[PDB]
């Protein structure tokens, strides 16, 4: 009496070769839809309660999950999750992309860069920069493209730049830069210097 | 709560090209199984409630019937009817054989041939033979391989042989033969002749 509907559809997935992949396909209706899967273009249907092969790396659980173990590159393509009751049908496609395994350490990340500040002449400024990464990023700075720190400035040990006794010359854009053996990233912010500071 | 089960499975069918073929696949269970079909080896599933193609010659009714119209020879092969509930699954295969259309009139049929009779010397015998056919069969007879009717015997107009005043010589096997421009068929029976008749 109630057509099948999706609670959680499956979405696309890119994953390294040899890993295990699971696509949700959660469903509701009355009667309760029993989901099965089909690789697009394949004659094989994958039904929930079976022995099953056992040589097959594909299994479907009674909750609607399609688990594929030890994926190889021939498993890439589209997978259709499906359900048929006397009340209706629904299908949903999700794409599997199989990649090579690569020892690739991601580049550093700046979770919080400097923020825009208007400050007052001959005060202090601490423009912050919190980076994370493995290997661990070295922080460094630029002012309108050029390196930074003159006298008057010095980079702290968490990475915050420290400028003291500002003046109208010290306005402009300051760029945080986190770099490591795996990449660089940057995060900019403008700092204005008035005598007012407001 | 009640696994799907077949009430009427589909069976094999041989039919002339261009005709329409329907395979039953009637089902029971709880919840009520919704049948779908799949040509074996094909990625296409045929679901009950759909627009559907309209260019497709295959449709599945909500009762589980697979109708294929104007069959051509590429439709031959195996067709799988299937049903999945939260309670279980069932499949059943049936084979479609597509033939050429042939103007072939079937051969005659003998629906009732002579029956075994023990009769008494110098009585009468009417060994019956009811044939049917289009074109209509000519009936004729043999006694132990040789044609039949001597004097004493004559074929009636419905086809019954008529022998009178039997004797111990007239025992043996009598064969009815129905023949037409489309075939022959035969039906034998032994007739024994005692002086007793019992």
From Swiss-Prot, chains A, B:
Residues 4-99, 108-192 form the Ig-like C2-type domain. Disulfide bonds join 25-81, 129-176. Glycans are attached at residue 116. It is found in: Membrane. It comes from the Eukaryota. Interacts with SLIT2. Belongs to the immunoglobulin superfamily. ROBO family. Receptor for SLIT2, and probably SLIT1, which are thought to act as molecular guidance cue in cellular migration, including axonal navigation at the ventral midline of the neural tube and projection of axons to different regions during neuronal development. It is linked to Vesicoureteral reflux 2: A disease belonging to the group of congenital anomalies of the kidney and urinary tract. It is characterized by the reflux of urine from the bladder into the ureters and sometimes into the kidneys, and is a risk factor for urinary tract infections. Primary disease results from a developmental defect of the ureterovesical junction. In combination with intrarenal reflux, the resulting inflammatory reaction may result in renal injury or scarring, also called reflux nephropathy. A chromosomal aberration involving ROBO2 is a cause of multiple congenital abnormalities, including severe bilateral VUR with ureterovesical junction defects. Translocation t(Y;3)(p11;p12) with PCDH11Y. This translocation disrupts ROBO2 and produces dominant-negative ROBO2 proteins that abrogate SLIT-ROBO signaling in vitro. This is Roundabout homolog 2. It comes from Homo sapiens (Human). The chain holds residues 311 to 509 of 1378 of the full protein.
